[PDB]
């Protein structure tokens with residue numbers, strides 16, 4: 001059997017709270033009425049939801065309405081409770097209302113509107129400073145929700161809204177977020193393939209906040225190297241292969257042995273043997289301007305098989321990669 005694991009920060013925060021903080025199944029919801037919101041236009045279709053720009057008719061404030069696709073009432077109360085618990089935190093999207101369409105009785109969430117920006121020209125005029133500033137802002141959100149006993153489990157660029165005009169960032173879509181409890185075994189069929197931590201890929205269920213830190217490193221690798229996504233896996237098994245060809249296999253089979261993780265028999269004959277690559281082999285003329293020694297050192301310390309040895313969000317925010325960003329904020 002697999003060796004147990006504990007988060008090495010914020011391990012017990014939820015045990016210390018009243019049970020109603022994390023026992024979301026018994027959370028009572030006060031379902032509002034839509035019609036206070038006229039849908040303006042559709043902003044996106046996800047697997048679990050559709051998102052619309054809408055107008056609150058009472059005061060004309062721009063707003064966003066996420067119409068939840070049929071899931072277990074559990075998953076809805078989870079997202080609501082986590083949103084309610086994180087309300088007011090740095091760079092957490094604000095849940096404004098909880099409504100139900102009066103005829104369909106379908107649940108919907110009403111969020112603050114964010115004037116997010118043309119990521120097309122955003123990715124072109126992206127500076128080394130830009131990437132450091134917004135990475136720091138994400139870490140603010142990550143460190144806060146981890147400190148509140150909450151894993152996001154779906155960190156990825158589509159879930160980061162930037163209002164580049166106002167230098168504002170919001171971490172959104174908390175529908176896969178979970179309360180961390182020491183010793184709990186989680187589903188690994190969460191997040192998007194290209195951002196899954198190896199713990200998800202090898203089926204290690206006793207993971208923790210450090211899962212978000214892996215995804216964040218995937219976002220970081222993808223941007224500084226101008227390669228989206230950075231690990232481009234054909235499927236969930238070929239994803240570990242793509243990681244193995246970069247991080248090497250020696251650390252992989254040590255991670256496996258260290259947690260007595262039983263590996264799938266698909267895996268034996270597809271991983272093979274690979275050396276840990278030096279990051280310089282991903283630098284080239286069209287991305288030098290974003291790569292620095294500090295960037296590479298920070299990236300290396302996020303992309304580790306062992307989740308325990310990844311930096312915490314707080315540790316990350318003290319890395320030399322962010323020294324100038326920290327200065328300007330004072």
Ligand SMILES: O=C(CCC(=O)NCCc1ccc(Cl)c(Cl)c1)/N=C/CCNc1nc2cc(C(=O)O)ccc2c2cnccc12
Pocket residue numbers: 043044051064066093111112113114115116119130131132134135138156157158159160161162172173174219223
């Ligand atoms: O645009 C996007 C993707 C944006 C993007 O590529 N970023 C780049 C990542 C990045 C870039 C540079 C750097 Cl340097 C770094 Cl680090 C990261 N995704 C939005 C879809 C629908 N739009 C909305 N979706 C919501 C959902 C929820 C929810 O489900 O909770 C609540 C509220 C909203 C919402 C609120 N107001 C306006 C629009 C929306």
